[PDB]
Amino acid sequence: TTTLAFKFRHGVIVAADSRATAGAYIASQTVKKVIEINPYLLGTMAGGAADCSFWERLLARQCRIYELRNKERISVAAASKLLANMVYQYKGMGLSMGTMICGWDKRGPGLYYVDSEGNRISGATFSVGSGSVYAYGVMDRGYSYDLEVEQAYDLARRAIYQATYRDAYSGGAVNLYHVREDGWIRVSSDNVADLHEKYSG
Amino acid sequence: RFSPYVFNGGTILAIAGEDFAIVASDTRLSEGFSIHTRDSPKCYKLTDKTVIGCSGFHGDCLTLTKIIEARLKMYKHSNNKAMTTGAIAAMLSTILYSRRFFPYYVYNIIGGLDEEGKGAVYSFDPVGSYQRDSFKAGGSASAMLQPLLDNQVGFKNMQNVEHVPLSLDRAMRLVKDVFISAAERDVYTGDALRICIVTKEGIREETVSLRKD
Amino acid sequence: SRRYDSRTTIFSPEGRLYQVEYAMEAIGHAGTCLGILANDGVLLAAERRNIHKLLDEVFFSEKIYKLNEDMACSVAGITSDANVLTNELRLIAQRYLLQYQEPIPCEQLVTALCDIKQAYTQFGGKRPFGVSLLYIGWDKHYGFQLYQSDPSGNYGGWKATCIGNNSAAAVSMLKQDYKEGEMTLKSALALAIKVLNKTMDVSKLSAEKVEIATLTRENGKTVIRVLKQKEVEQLIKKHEEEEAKAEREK
Amino acid sequence: MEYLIGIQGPDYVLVASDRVAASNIVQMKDDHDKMFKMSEKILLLCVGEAGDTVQFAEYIQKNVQLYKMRNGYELSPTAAANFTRRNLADCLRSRTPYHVNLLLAGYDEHEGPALYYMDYLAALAKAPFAAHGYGAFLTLSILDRYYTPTISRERAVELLRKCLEELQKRFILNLPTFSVRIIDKNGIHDLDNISFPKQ
Amino acid sequence: YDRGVNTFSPEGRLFQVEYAIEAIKLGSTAIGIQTSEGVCLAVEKRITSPLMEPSSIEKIVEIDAHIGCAMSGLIADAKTLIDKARVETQNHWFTYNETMTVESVTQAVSNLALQFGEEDADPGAMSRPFGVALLFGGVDEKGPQLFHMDPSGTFVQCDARAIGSASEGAQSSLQEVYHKSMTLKEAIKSSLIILKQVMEEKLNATNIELATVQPGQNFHMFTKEELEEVIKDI
Amino acid sequence: NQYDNDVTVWSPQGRIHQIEYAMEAVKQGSATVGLKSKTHAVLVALKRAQSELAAHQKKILHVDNHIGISIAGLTADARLLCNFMRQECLDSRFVFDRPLPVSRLVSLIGSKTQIPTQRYGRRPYGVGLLIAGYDDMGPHIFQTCPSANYFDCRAMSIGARSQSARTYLERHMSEFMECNLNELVKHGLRALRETLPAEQDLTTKNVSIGIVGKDLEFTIYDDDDVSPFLEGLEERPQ
Amino acid sequence: SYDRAITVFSPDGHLFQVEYAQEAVKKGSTAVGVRGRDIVVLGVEKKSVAKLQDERTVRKICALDDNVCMAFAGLTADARIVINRARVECQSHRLTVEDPVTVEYITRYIASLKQRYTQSNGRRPFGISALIVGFDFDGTPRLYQTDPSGTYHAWKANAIGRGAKSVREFLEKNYTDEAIETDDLTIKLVIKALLEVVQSGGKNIELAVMRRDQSLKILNPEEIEKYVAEIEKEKEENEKKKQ
Amino acid sequence: TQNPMVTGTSVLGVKFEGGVVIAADMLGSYGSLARFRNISRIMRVNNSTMLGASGDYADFQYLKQVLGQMVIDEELLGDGHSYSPRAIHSWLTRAMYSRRSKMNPLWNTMVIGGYADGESFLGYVDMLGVAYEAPSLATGYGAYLAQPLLREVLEKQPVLSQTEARDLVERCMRVLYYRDARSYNRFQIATVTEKGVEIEGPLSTETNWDIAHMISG
Ligand SMILES: CC(C)C[C@H](NC(=O)[C@H](CCc1ccccc1)NC(=O)CN1CCOCC1)C(=O)N[C@@H](Cc1ccccc1)C(=O)N[C@@H](CC(C)C)[C@@H](O)[C@H](C)CO
Numbered sequence A: 001t002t003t004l005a006f007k008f009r010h011g012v013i014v015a016a017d018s019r020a021t022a023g024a025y026i027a028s029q030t031v032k033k034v035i036e037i038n039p040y041l042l043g044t045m046a047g048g049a050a051d052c053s054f055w056e057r058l059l060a061r062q063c064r065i066y067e068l069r070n071k072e073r074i075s076v077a078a079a080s081k082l083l084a085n086m087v088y089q090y091k092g093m094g095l096s097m098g099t100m101i102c103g104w105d106k107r108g109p110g111l112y113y114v115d116s117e118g119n120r121i122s123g124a125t126f127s128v129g130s131g132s133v134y135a136y137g138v139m140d141r142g143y144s145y146d147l148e149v150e151q152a153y154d155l156a157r158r159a160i161y162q163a164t165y166r167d168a169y170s171g172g173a174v175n176l177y178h179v180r181e182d183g184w185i186r187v188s189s190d191n192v193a194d195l196h197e198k199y200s201g
Numbered sequence B: 001r002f003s004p005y006v007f008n009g010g011t012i013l014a015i016a017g018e019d020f021a022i023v024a025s026d027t028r029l030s031e032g033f034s035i036h037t038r039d040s041p042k043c044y045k046l047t048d049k050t051v052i053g054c055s056g057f058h059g060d061c062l063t064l065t066k067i068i069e070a071r072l073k074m075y076k077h078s079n080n081k082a083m084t085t086g087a088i089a090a091m092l093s094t095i096l097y098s099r100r101f102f103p104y105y106v107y108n109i110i111g112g113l114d115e116e117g118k119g120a121v122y123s124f125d126p127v128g129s130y131q132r133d134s135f136k137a138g139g140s141a142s143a144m145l146q147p148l149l150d151n152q153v154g155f156k157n158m159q160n161v162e163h164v165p166l167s168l169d170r171a172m173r174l175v176k177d178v179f180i181s182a183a184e185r186d187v188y189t190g191d192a193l194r195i196c197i198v199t200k201e202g203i204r205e206e207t208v209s210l211r212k213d
Numbered sequence C: 001s002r003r004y005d006s007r008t009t010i011f012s013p014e015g016r017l018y019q020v021e022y023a024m025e026a027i028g029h030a031g032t033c034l035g036i037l038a039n040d041g042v043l044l045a046a047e048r049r050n051i052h053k054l055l056d057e058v059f060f061s062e063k064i065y066k067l068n069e070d071m072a073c074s075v076a077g078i079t080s081d082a083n084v085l086t087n088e089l090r091l092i093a094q095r096y097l098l099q100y101q102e103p104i105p106c107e108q109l110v111t112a113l114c115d116i117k118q119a120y121t122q123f124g125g126k127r128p129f130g131v132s133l134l135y136i137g138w139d140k141h142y143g144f145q146l147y148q149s150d151p152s153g154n155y156g157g158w159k160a161t162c163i164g165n166n167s168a169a170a171v172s173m174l175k176q177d178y179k180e181g182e183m184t185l186k187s188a189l190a191l192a193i194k195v196l197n198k199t200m201d202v203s204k205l206s207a208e209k210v211e212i213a214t215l216t217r218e219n220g221k222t223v224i225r226v227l228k229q230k231e232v233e234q235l236i237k238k239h240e241e242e243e244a245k246a247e248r249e250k
Numbered sequence D: 001m002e003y004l005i006g007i008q009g010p011d012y013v014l015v016a017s018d019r020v021a022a023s024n025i026v027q028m029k030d031d032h033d034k035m036f037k038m039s040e041k042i043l044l045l046c047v048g049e050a051g052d053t054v055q056f057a058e059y060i061q062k063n064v065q066l067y068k069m070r071n072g073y074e075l076s077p078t079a080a081a082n083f084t085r086r087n088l089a090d091c092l093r094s095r096t097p098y099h100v101n102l103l104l105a106g107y108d109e110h111e112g113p114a115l116y117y118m119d120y121l122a123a124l125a126k127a128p129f130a131a132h133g134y135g136a137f138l139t140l141s142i143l144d145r146y147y148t149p150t151i152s153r154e155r156a157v158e159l160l161r162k163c164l165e166e167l168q169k170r171f172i173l174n175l176p177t178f179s180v181r182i183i184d185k186n187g188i189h190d191l192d193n194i195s196f197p198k199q
Numbered sequence E: 001y002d003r004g005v006n007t008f009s010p011e012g013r014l015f016q017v018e019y020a021i022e023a024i025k026l027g028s029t030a031i032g033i034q035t036s037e038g039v040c041l042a043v044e045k046r047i048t049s050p051l052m053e054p055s056s057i058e059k060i061v062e063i064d065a066h067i068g069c070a071m072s073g074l075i076a077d078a079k080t081l082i083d084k085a086r087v088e089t090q091n092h093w094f095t096y097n098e099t100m101t102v103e104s105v106t107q108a109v110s111n112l113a114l115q116f117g118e119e120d121a122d123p124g125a126m127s128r129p130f131g132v133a134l135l136f137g138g139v140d141e142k143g144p145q146l147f148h149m150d151p152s153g154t155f156v157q158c159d160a161r162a163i164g165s166a167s168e169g170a171q172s173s174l175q176e177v178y179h180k181s182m183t184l185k186e187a188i189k190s191s192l193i194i195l196k197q198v199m200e201e202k203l204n205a206t207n208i209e210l211a212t213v214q215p216g217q218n219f220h221m222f223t224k225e226e227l228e229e230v231i232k233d234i
Numbered sequence F: 001n002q003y004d005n006d007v008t009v010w011s012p013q014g015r016i017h018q019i020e021y022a023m024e025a026v027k028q029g030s031a032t033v034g035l036k037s038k039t040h041a042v043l044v045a046l047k048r049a050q051s052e053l054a055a056h057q058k059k060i061l062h063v064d065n066h067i068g069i070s071i072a073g074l075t076a077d078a079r080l081l082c083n084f085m086r087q088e089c090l091d092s093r094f095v096f097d098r099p100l101p102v103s104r105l106v107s108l109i110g111s112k113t114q115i116p117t118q119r120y121g122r123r124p125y126g127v128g129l130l131i132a133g134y135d136d137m138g139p140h141i142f143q144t145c146p147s148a149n150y151f152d153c154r155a156m157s158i159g160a161r162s163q164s165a166r167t168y169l170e171r172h173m174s175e176f177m178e179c180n181l182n183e184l185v186k187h188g189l190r191a192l193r194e195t196l197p198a199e200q201d202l203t204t205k206n207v208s209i210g211i212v213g214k215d216l217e218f219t220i221y222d223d224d225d226v227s228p229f230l231e232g233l234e235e236r237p238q
Numbered sequence G: 001s002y003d004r005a006i007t008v009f010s011p012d013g014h015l016f017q018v019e020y021a022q023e024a025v026k027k028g029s030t031a032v033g034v035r036g037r038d039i040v041v042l043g044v045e046k047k048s049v050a051k052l053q054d055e056r057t058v059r060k061i062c063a064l065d066d067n068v069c070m071a072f073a074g075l076t077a078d079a080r081i082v083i084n085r086a087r088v089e090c091q092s093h094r095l096t097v098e099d100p101v102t103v104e105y106i107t108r109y110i111a112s113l114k115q116r117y118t119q120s121n122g123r124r125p126f127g128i129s130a131l132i133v134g135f136d137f138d139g140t141p142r143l144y145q146t147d148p149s150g151t152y153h154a155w156k157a158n159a160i161g162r163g164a165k166s167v168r169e170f171l172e173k174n175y176t177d178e179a180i181e182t183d184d185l186t187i188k189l190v191i192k193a194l195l196e197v198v199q200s201g202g203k204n205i206e207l208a209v210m211r212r213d214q215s216l217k218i219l220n221p222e223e224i225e226k227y228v229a230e231i232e233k234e235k236e237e238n239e240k241k242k243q
Numbered sequence H: 001t002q003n004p005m006v007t008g009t010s011v012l013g014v015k016f017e018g019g020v021v022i023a024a025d026m027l028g029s030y031g032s033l034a035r036f037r038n039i040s041r042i043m044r045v046n047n048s049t050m051l052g053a054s055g056d057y058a059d060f061q062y063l064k065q066v067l068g069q070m071v072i073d074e075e076l077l078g079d080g081h082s083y084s085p086r087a088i089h090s091w092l093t094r095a096m097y098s099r100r101s102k103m104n105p106l107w108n109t110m111v112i113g114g115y116a117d118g119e120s121f122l123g124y125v126d127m128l129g130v131a132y133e134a135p136s137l138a139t140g141y142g143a144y145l146a147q148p149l150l151r152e153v154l155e156k157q158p159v160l161s162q163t164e165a166r167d168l169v170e171r172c173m174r175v176l177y178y179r180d181a182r183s184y185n186r187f188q189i190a191t192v193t194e195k196g197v198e199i200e201g202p203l204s205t206e207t208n209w210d211i212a213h214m215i216s217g
Helices: A049-070 A076-088 A132-142 A149-166 A192-200 B058-079 B085-097 B142-152 B168-185 C018-027 C079-100 C106-122 C167-176 C185-199 C229-246 D050-071 D077-090 D136-146 D153-170 E015-024 E075-096 E102-110 E167-177 E184-198 E224-232 F017-023 F075-096 F102-117 F162-176 F181-193 G016-026 G076-096 G103-119 G164-174 G183-195 G221-234 H057-077 H085-101 H142-154 H162-179
Strands: A003-008 A011-016 A020-022 A025-028 A035-038 A041-043 A097-105 A108-115 A120-122 A125-128 A173-180 A183-191 B011-016 B021-026 B029-031 B034-037 B043-047 B050-056 B106-113 B119-124 B130-133 B135-139 B192-199 B202-209 C033-037 C041-047 C064-068 C071-077 C131-139 C143-149 C155-158 C160-163 C210-218 C221-226 D004-008 D013-018 D021-023 D026-029 D035-039 D042-048 D100-108 D112-118 D124-126 D129-132 D177-184 D187-190 E030-035 E038-044 E060-064 E067-073 E132-140 E143-149 E155-157 E160-163 E208-214 E217-221 F032-036 F040-046 F060-064 F067-073 F127-135 F138-144 F150-153 F155-158 F207-213 F216-221 G031-035 G039-044 G061-063 G068-074 G128-135 G141-146 G152-154 G157-160 G206-211 H006-008 H011-016 H019-025 H028-030 H033-036 H049-056 H108-116 H119-125 H131-133 H136-138 H187-193 H196-203
Touching (some): A003 A097, A003 A108, A003 A132, A011 A108, A035 A049, A035 A097, A041 A049, A041 A076, A049 A076, A049 A097, A049 B085, A049 E075, A076 A097, A076 A108, A076 A120, A076 G076, A097 A125, A108 A125, A125 A132, A132 A149, A132 D026, A149 A173, A149 A192, A183 A192, B011 B050, B011 B106, B011 B119, B011 B142, B021 B050, B021 B106, B021 B168, B034 H131, B034 H142, B050 B058, B050 B085, B050 B192, B058 B106, B058 F075, B085 B106, B085 B130, B106 B135, B106 B192, B119 B135, B142 B168, C018 C071, C033 C143, C033 C167, C033 C185, C041 C071, C041 C131, C041 C143, C041 C185, C064 C131, C071 C079, C071 C210, C079 C106, C079 D077, C106 C131, C106 C143, C106 C155, C106 G076, C131 C160, C160 C167, C185 C210, D004 D042, D004 D100, D004 D112, D004 D136, D013 D042, D013 D100, D013 D112, D013 D153, D042 D050, D042 D077, D042 D177, D050 D100, D077 D100, D077 D124, D100 D129, D100 D177, D112 D129, D129 D136, D136 D153, E015 E067, E030 E067, E030 E132, E030 E143, E030 E167, E030 E184, E038 E067, E038 E184, E060 E208, E067 E075, E067 E208, E075 E102, E075 E132, E075 G103, E102 E132, E102 E143, E102 E155, E102 F075, E143 E160, E184 E208, E184 E224, F032 F127, F032 F138, F032 F162, F032 F181, F040 F067, F040 F127, F040 F138, F040 F181, F060 F075, F060 F207, F060 F216, F067 F075, F067 F207, F067 F216, F075 F102, F075 F127, F102 F127, F102 F138, F102 F150, F102 H057, F127 F155, F127 F207, F138 F155, F181 F207, G016 G128, G031 G068, G031 G128, G031 G164, G039 G128, G039 G141, G068 G076, G076 G103, G076 G128, G103 G128, G103 G152, G128 G157, G128 G206, G141 G157, G157 G164, G164 G183, G183 G206, G183 G221, H006 H057, H011 H142, H011 H162, H019 H049, H019 H108, H019 H119, H049 H057, H049 H085, H049 H196, H057 H085, H057 H108, H085 H119, H085 H131, H108 H187, H119 H136, H136 H142
Antiparallel strands (some): A003 A011, A035 A041, A041 A097, B011 B021, B011 B135, B021 B192, B029 B034, B043 B050, B050 B106, B119 B130, B192 B202, C033 C160, C041 C210, C064 C071, C071 C131, C131 C143, C143 C155, C210 C221, D004 D013, D004 D129, D013 D177, D035 D042, D100 D112, D112 D124, D177 D187, E030 E038, E030 E160, E060 E067, E067 E132, E132 E143, E143 E155, F032 F040, F032 F155, F040 F207, F060 F067, F207 F216, G031 G039, G031 G157, G039 G206, G141 G152, H006 H049, H011 H019, H011 H136, H019 H187, H028 H033, H049 H108, H108 H119, H119 H131, H187 H196
16 A cells, blocks of 8 residues: 645645555555545545445444534544544454545644554644555655645655555555545546656656 | 364456456365365356355355345345345445454455446455456456456557457457466366356356366 | 332422422431531531430440541431431442542532432432431531532532421521621530520430530541530530520510 | 653643654654643643553543533542542453553642652652653653752753753654643643754 | 323224324424425424524434435424434445435334333333324435325325324315426425415514425525525415 | 233133234224135235325235235334244245245244233234245245234135125135136235225225235235236126 | 333323423523623522522532533432533543534433433433523534423523513513623623512522633622612613603 | 364265265274274154264264254144255254354264255265265265265266165275274165165175285285
């Protein structure tokens, strides 16, 4: 895996690869690792595939029920806290799962990192997965809060790309989403083979 | 001590066409270095529009099969309609994850038709992680089947080739070919190949023969 | 089964709980028991119904229970229910102590018992406890304190109050001789002697018939003491020497 | 790995913690806060296991606040400390033990300033000064060398600076910035973050 | 003379259930109309004081994006049922990745019918039936659908139905104006007309609430302005 | 009056009034008919409507591929019992991979429904059932009462004014065993229509049919699918 | 346990136990509350002044959280139960959700609790009604009212308890935009409304106010006597020079 | 059962024209010890089916008790329905898998033979719940020794007569007695036909030992 997300002036950028492995064997390269919880809430996905999918889906259910009950939309902090609380009750049982809850809140752009270990921290930028370090490199070397939209897109896409270059367990296609105040938008979905041609020559 | 698992072999394949869906599997049930039976297809007809392939540990295969049957019936009694293919996929996901801490040792591939009549494959992992595919292999010889279909159906690594959609005929011969090749290298794959074709007309069953060694 | 049920936790058409009121009627027949709050302490004074020539007297008291090193209580009604509630009170106090490592604030203890009584009024189908309680104590939050709790699970903090037989007249009599902010333990004892004198059906009042305890603050520690017969006799005699004195002016 | 430090003065309690939230080999947060306001005059510095820290700390916090709402007055720092110690000790031999080391800073209207130290085994001990984490091994001795019971808050802050600088010198972990707060008769006061202009 | 909550009358009915049916008759009257262009639900709010904020009176709620519900009688009882319905729909979405048919939801809620009793029961189990009546209006694969449910648990599909105090009269007035081909505007108009007839207070934009569920649009609660624009053509 | 309100109270005449009161619930619903040939089992149910704007109440329910039922009484209890039967059938298929013999399912219904008639605070099931099934003993029509008693029938009718239908069936029992499917459904429809005044008769809007047999799984015909059965019937007398 | 149906339907379709509980509420001390622009005020009448009783230990106004306060009318013990459970819930909400609590939410919780007690075996409806008051984030001041039945609504101003209809009518005829245009004027409105039913005093009235992002503030009898003096002055400077 | 004690070895099965035949020795072994040399490891489950069992004999006795009770329970009704061999096989599969999933297996490997509705049935059931149908079956060492012989014949001649199948079985039992160190020269043969289930008494296997005098040359 190799997901990453950072918040700047114009919302929250979210990006991921799509590779899924079963050992050294590449089981898939067409995995949607950015779960669409709500039209304003996204959840990245890294680690145990079934674990992430199931728990974030359940999170989506819970957020929907919250929306119906309280006649208002759930906050990013509340969603992340919900997921964290659900996951914590299974601590030590072997759930492998590291996700990012991103969205736009009444407090503006929101981004949280939530672990199967029990972590839950808000922050500006985050990178999760086997290739997270490689992404962290370029992302940190190119990040700014005053980044223009297309620039942020380039930064995220490139970071995930370099990550796929070094990390043997990351590849497939770079997917890119943008979270704005009126909801999120599916920015891009470029295959790595094409991005190679674009970035090298 | 005591192990509640035993690998029984078996290979499984599903291809999705524009108006069809193929679900095929070998018919060899084995254990250790021995053959249990040569007449054991891994294909299970769920509905007129949906066929399931289950490989791995035979106990969990049987159990999961019967469970899926029962729950199909339940859904039918509850909503007065048959389960759509994608619905069966989601249900299967939940059922598989329900044993997250004592998994069914089963590789599952669902092949059928969606609500628009088009073909669809859904590939699963033993604990419920699934996705929709045009074509996927699973089971012992999976790594032998996948790369060819990536080349021939996905047209990958081929320069200036035409993207002609897969016809039922070509798909059929492709299935027979990959299974025949797998029978050469995989020791768990052999005896016979059962193929299940799913169209608007219904479900056909064909049976090619594989080597017995 | 449904026939034998007396429906103890059910609203009456007027919007009231009959078993609670009947329990109040039970309390009205029990020995008179009052308490007064002062500036240098707080005291309890109760009529003794266990007054017979052949009784053995093997306890420090009869209607005065020690609950906590900073708290004591007196009781009126069914004595066994009183035993249950007092034991439970001690339990609660020791739990709070075990948890926070400091004495339980008086009001918290009272509310803690009252929640149980209320619970007995709302569900379970059991009869409520026919017991009213008076609580005296000291804590670092509100100093000296007097409380009263009824079987309804309801409670309140008082500067002086009474509970038991002839409680009403005793309350008005306390209203008359009250002294907000100017009360000392001695004058409070005088008041207690007076009220208990007029309210107790058997007049003259020997020290045999009453029971008085005081809670005071002395050198950092809290002292709870039950007065001996002699001291009570002193208070009574003084009351008569103040009653035969005011009657001279005629 | 996390670092806590507490220094009690005659009428105040000075507390400080690192601002690093790290996982694996990377710092994931440079502004992490390890302190929890429980009363208007009580701070809880919790550190340790992944989810155990926040879970336990927030549980204690909300229970203290519940006490405040139920009774109209706040728990004393001592009562608080023994409450947390009771909770932590009760879960010690249970199915769900909380692996947390903690400090409790407080000011009482009666007893004055107070600092408490708690093992993950829930052993509560009052101290003029304490520290948690590996960094403690490098700082405690310093605190032994220069601490006096009558130390002024300015001198206390300077001492804290000596400690943190020592961390910058000998400790192999990064730890560039530190949260610093003080507690007195006027409650909790946030101070300027002690930081070292590395990069 | 007191008896068990699961006692039968000599006529062959449960006393408590019948009494609940009697309880419905004291509730705010509501009307639901089914139309191939969508389903509409209207209900009077019965404001008992000018000081009472009318926007805090909701007798029409959203079960899901494709299903809305109107209620009459003891509303407090209805809240539980509503939440149960929402939870059921979300569970079904989680499990099967699809929306619930209106009939399935209605049936699911209807399963909590005679789930009451004394002996041989759970500590938190219901002691009495729900004194409320429900109209489920929604759009599924079978198009627009309207269902009715009463404390007996008997649920049935209706083309047009009125529940509440003015049940009979409003039902007659409904029978007089319903043909299985009305437009949604006609349905809303008729609903508000019959409502104005049966209501004791003057029908206005803050006196009632109206909501529609149509094949192309989600559950929509009519705002003040839209309500006015329909009341306009009285 | 003192033996009326509890199911655990015998009357001095050796009767249980709550059970009988529960039996009265069956007669409160719309009538239904069940009959069997030698190859087919058929349920014909008269659906009832509140107003003309309300759809007609479901009266025929699917249990298993070889078993269906027709209800008469409290729809909630009906749904309960139905779900029970469905569950038992599913269990039988899960365990033995063969369909549950109808008679055994009926026996289980008896056992289950008997329990609450003997416990304080409990109540009998306020519903009567007609069960049509097919197994390797042929077709079967069963009847279950709130009294937890069950009957194996050649033909039966339960509910409001079902006496007429009963009287009809009792004359054509001898014909039933040899009829083809269409004639069987015919007889069922005539029996059903006997329970109506001459001012009203059967319609595609108020008649449901359930059929199971050696050549057919249990199927339910409701609206336009009922017409091939109604169209082919006498004009009836007055 | 006690598996007995207590609250059941009557042949006319009534829940007698709930109605009885409402009658128990009717016997309670009058409790009123009004909602203003930047303030919200709750006042309770006949506090049963015995003058030998500590006023603090018998207050009918309780804070549930820093955000929400609440007054009640009816059985005081039941009210203690409900209040404590409400406080616990207010904390649990913070535990499961980072955000605090909305007035509507805690009101809904209390209402649901009461209803649950109207439909559960072996239990018995709470004999209280509650006036819940708060200033949830977004600044919007809100006041709600609950009922033993489980029903709950929002109000601009309301009253419960002994002679609640009288104070309801008074408030209906007196709630304007001119009134409650200033904080002191809203408080004066509450005091007047209370005086329109209380046994003519001021030492019988307990009034408390919540304002903006501040904490709950209870009014001392001195300040209450001051506002009552201004009210008795406005009743002789605008009602004496015209009548 | 986590540690099997007294056990029985191979169990053979094979279909023939109008019936099914099953074989199993009468030995219960306590490790390498031939402890109980006279026990039946074959049960008559009603008139249409029959069961042979390998593994822990006690667990087999348990299953024997349970199955016997089920058959009695059914026979009490007399409603004209009875357990088909396939049904019994399905039940047994369900049971073994259930015990497997409780991490408390019944240490048995079983062969169910049957004849109902004119069709011959032969089913295999594991202790893990692995079950299947086949024209020939062999458990334990049989699966390595007897089964290859059985398949050789059945792929050269699918349909066998009863005498042919019986001969095949006899020869297989001979091979097993030769090569299986935990077998015994005293076995039983059970047969299902339309006439019912018949278990033939203590049989012995003729043995050739001429290759004993081939040491030198
Ligand atoms: C079949 C594929 C498509 C999915 C794959 N599943 C699997 O690998 C399943 C999981 C079975 C299981 C049992 C018990 C408890 C948990 C899981 N295992 C198997 O299918 C069979 N194998 C047996 C021998 O070989 C290895 C696995 C998977 O989840 N892969 C993870 C890595 C992993 C995590 C935890 C356990 C096992 C594997 C993955 O791709 N993660 C990516 C993100 C997600 C959303 C796909 C990333 O982490 C990136 C790609 C790096 O791997």
